[PDB]
């Protein structure tokens, strides 16, 4: 009999997750997600039975202080405590030399993690914003004062009290009918009343013109630029602080890289104090989370996008992919099983099945996907719900209105 | 033998700063700065080590009169006592005469430092603004024409005709309501008037369609004014004074010059009290801001550019440079230095390290809003600070209203 | 006795030019500008008699092609033809390296020469341009159309023909205040004379909305991006060709250059053809007025805003400098006037001299002192010269209908 492989790997979500059971299940039963999937699959095609195994330390593997001894995952293939290793492990250069990985089975880029800075949401009432409560106020003032104070004109001697219909009730409506501009039935023949009648007509013409300009602003636009995705810029502010992974390979990236931006922000990152790297990519996001948006974290998109789609749904992601890189299965330099995993892992690829994985997992657990991603589109029609408290307000006054009638109409007949 | 450099040199920013670890480092690690850089060049293209200190006195220096002996920079150099100088420092011909400089690396003028007005808001008036004063005179007495030409062309004595009702004052009255575009209760009714009323009807339907284009932007202009603006006025006023560094080279030009702007401003400077002059930059600057604006510096465009870059930016500079001058890295004379120091700075300014340096410490590190501050999102709302002139007019016009009509009263009762 | 100076330097407006009589006037005397002035004071400080000559070859100079000779004017130094050059020579490291350079007495960089593509002029009838010369002419059209229809249904039978007030003129008058939204003395009282109203009335309203929206695009900005600075289009597209100076040092900082995007400049400009490179500036800057403003040349700033001040202004500078660099007075290794040339180069500077040369020269002849820079704020008030047409449009109507009633005041008398 064959002696079964040992297989080690890393806990990450979706790739490996804990099972509701783990309490009573059997070791392997006690894993779950899409790497175990992947194992099965490999497996099966290949034909050796396996155990699983969780790395004993927890880190994705680097290199130490010149000591050339290796971190946790790389590690262990390199001194033969295990057999291969299946997770999300990207392959580089280094870890090239000392170990032989398959093909990619899924193709990723480096992305930033913001959040997202809320979502306005328009009254009911909104057309009476675009002047303040105090004009309106204001305005309420102005009307009743000179509506008054044409009565008190109006109705004062022409000596002749027939010679003015202005009674304080037509005044009011004179006044009214002038503010909306919509037109006039009897106007004063008089210099006193005139002379209020000018002054009324100068105040509306000013105060409408400048509420029908400001309209437009507020229905021509309602974007905000928000945080800038341009790494360049984000270097060139220090309010927000970001960080990567201890022990990952985005540290030995922007360690590596010459790249003036890149060099500029590993500087910043070496020299930034106090420690912006977090030891789990779950710790950085909910560093993140609890830091009020004045933190950020840097992180994979294949893990970015995952996250994006789980509640509570706080998190944006800005800017493209700052590269292009590979997850490979990996096996210990001269050995068996490299070329039968290569077989296996491009048959699964042409047949598709790898892509069944990702949607059983990544996005039909999508709840927050429902057309997030909005438009930029800039001459979007007005729809009903924007309109309906002004026919809130006309269908309440055509009911008072008829109540009122049928008021006056039983006292008009009981007086 | 290859033995260690001294280079005597200020401390000034962004030139040459403490860092932080200072107490806890040797020298070489204590300074960092745009001029540590630059000296870090120099030795690797000449192939030397380097030692820096910080000159005796802090003072760049001038030769006293009478006793023709230089102070500390000057005197490092000149009686041997450093090997090199690295710092910002002002080629000048009485230098000239006695040290070595290189070709320049920098170029500087003398400017103006103020401390800043805030932005002020706009007047009560403002509704007026969107035209000009033309205009409005013109608006004027268009009304007036039309008034008048409808009046003569109604009631014009047919071969007794009574029917046109455009007396002068229903003619004015007739003519204002059309142009507030409300409505009136006679119309022409005859082909001239029918005439002159449409010609008045269309003037009038372009004049508000082009003050009703933009009238919220104008309510909310948000700045106007500076207090002075041609670096001339200094010199006509006594109100705000001004002054200069002591010991420094602007000082020596103000004394040597004999424009006549400049030696009006230095015969003030001769002569007023208590003194305006201070023994270091950073005195100069916190004078100005203390001073309520009452103050002004004179001070080098490099430093009034830094100083415009960093918190909390409450300080500006106006107009333009005075006059043109270069920084050149100093050697005392017949050194075996100079050449290859003068091919160094050559070179590097050739490949642009210059440029790069000039960039990170200047540039990168600024701060305020003037960085960036051009998104002009729409302005919320309106307040009624913006509107309260318009109130203003209608309730004076009540008030008029009143007094007319009482004056009315009275009159006719006896 | 004293050895007279043989000075020697190239003709370039303005720092030399030839003298109106110079054929009849002294060799020396047919020499005037900006370097004769300099070099007299130059003489007058060191005290040597000097001669004046014009380089042979008429070029600034650069190192051989592969002979390891020297051409004109470095040449002319080098080899004992000249004893002092004085021209706007730029101090540059090769040449540094061979002949000594004073201190600079001007300051400079490099800048990019363009065609400016004209002005528009608005008319006096500016108001009418949101709409289209035949949008006006249907629109009169449609109103005698809708104002005869009005008449033949009104003035129809009732059966009674006093019934409606609508003659031919009052239909006319209704239908040109309905137009104006400027309101009238009365409406239709009948079925079809009411559906004809109410369809001029929608006609009116979409038409004169529209008109006052556009105008205030047409009325708010108005600018041209004119082609993008810093050699964005030159870098990015072929469709400028960009063409600098033979045997200059600008040719020699661009060839010499490493900075990617004017490393990519060289690599266009050595491969490009046909040759895009002159003999001279002016033969550079006429190819640029020719070519229609498909061609550009490159040429330092003291040249770029002399030739801005001279006729026919045409040109446009674009972009800031590029370098800052020198022009220094330059002398043979060795030779004794360097030594007190360079105080007087010095002291000219510390009198100020110098900018009172560079004022009368370039400046107090910059005779096109259009300085049509403008500014460039939004919030800009309208000024009378727009209006104007409508005042003219206004007082010819008042005349004309004063005319009328003369002439109908007449014929009644005289019927
Ligand atoms: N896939 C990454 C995980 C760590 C990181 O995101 O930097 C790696 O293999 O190192
Ligand atoms: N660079 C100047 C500093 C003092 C000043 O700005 O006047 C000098 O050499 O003295
Ligand atoms: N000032 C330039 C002239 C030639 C050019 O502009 O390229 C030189 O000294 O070479």
């Given at each position: 009999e064959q002696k079964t492989v040992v297989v080690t790997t890393i806990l990450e979500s979706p790739y490996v997750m804990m099972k509701k059971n783990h309490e009573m299940l059997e070791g392997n039963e006690r894993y779950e997600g899409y790497c175990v999937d992947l194992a099965a699959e490999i497996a099966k095609h290949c034909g050796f039975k396996y155990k699983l195994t969780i790395v004993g330390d927890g880190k994705y593997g680097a290199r130490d202080a010149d000591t050339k001894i290796w971190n946790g995952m790389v590690g262990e293939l390199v001194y033969g405590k295990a057999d291969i290793a299946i997770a999300?492990?990207?392959?580089?250069?280094?870890?090239?030399?000392?170990?032989?990985?398959?093909?990619?089975?899924?193709?990723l880029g480096i992305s930033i993690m913001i959040k997202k800075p809320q979502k306005s949401?328009?009254?009911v009432f909104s057309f009476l914003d675009p002047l303040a409560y105090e004009i309106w106020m204001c305005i309420v003032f102005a009307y009743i004062g000179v509506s008054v104070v044409l009565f008190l004109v109006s109705r004062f001697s022409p000596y002749s009290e027939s010679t003015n219909e202005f009674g304080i009730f037509n005044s009011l409506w004179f006044s009214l009918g002038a503010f909306m501009?919509?037109?006039?039935?009897?106007?004063?023949?008089?210099?006193?009343?005139?002379?209020?009648?000018?002054?009324?007509?100068?105040?509306?013409?000013?105060?409408?013109?400048?509420?029908?300009?400001?309209?437009?602003?507020?229905?021509?636009?309602?974007?905000?630029?928000?945080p800038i995705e341009s790494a360049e810029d984000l270097s060139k502010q220090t309010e927000i602080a970001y960080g990567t992974?201890?022990?990952?390979?985005?540290?030995?990236?922007?360690?590596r890289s010459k790249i003036a931006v890149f060099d500029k922000m590993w500087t910043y990152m070496r020299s930034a104090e106090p420690s912006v790297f977090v030891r789990t990519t779950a710790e950085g996001v909910?560093?993140?989370?609890?830091?009020?948006?004045?933190?950020?974290?840097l992180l994979e998109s294949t893990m970015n996008e995952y996250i994006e789609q789980r509640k509570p749904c706080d998190t944006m992601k800005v800017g493209g992919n700052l590269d292009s890189k590979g997850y490979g299965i990996a096996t210990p330099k001269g050995s068996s099983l490299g070329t039968p995993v290569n077989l296996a892992v491009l048959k699964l690829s042409e047949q598709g099945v790898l892509d069944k994985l990702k949607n059983k997992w990544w996005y039909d657990k999508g709840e927050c996907?429902?057309?997030?991603?909005?438009?930029?589109?800039?001459?979007?029609?007005?729809?009903?719900?924007?309109?309906?408290?002004?026919?809130?307000?006309?269908?309440?006054?055509?009911?008072?209105?008829?109540?009122?009638?049928?008021?006056?109409?039983?006292?008009?007949?009981?007086?």
């Open positions: 999300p492990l990207t392959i580089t250069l280094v870890r090239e030399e000392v170990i032989d990985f398959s093909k990619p089975f899924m193709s949401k328009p009254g501009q919509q037109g006039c039935d009897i106007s004063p023949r008089s210099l006193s009343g005139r002379i209020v009648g000018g002054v009324w007509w100068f105040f509306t013409l000013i105060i409408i013109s400048s509420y029908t300009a400001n309209l437009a602003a507020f229905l021509t636009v309602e974007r905000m630029v928000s992974l201890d022990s990952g390979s985005t540290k030995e990236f922007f360690r909910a560093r993140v989370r609890k830091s009020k948006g004045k933190y950020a974290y996907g429902a057309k997030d991603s909005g438009s930029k589109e800039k001459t979007s029609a007005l729809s009903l719900s924007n309109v309906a408290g002004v026919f809130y307000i006309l269908v309440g006054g055509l009911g008072l209105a008829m109540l009122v009638a049928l008021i006056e109409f039983c006292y008009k007949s009981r007086a």
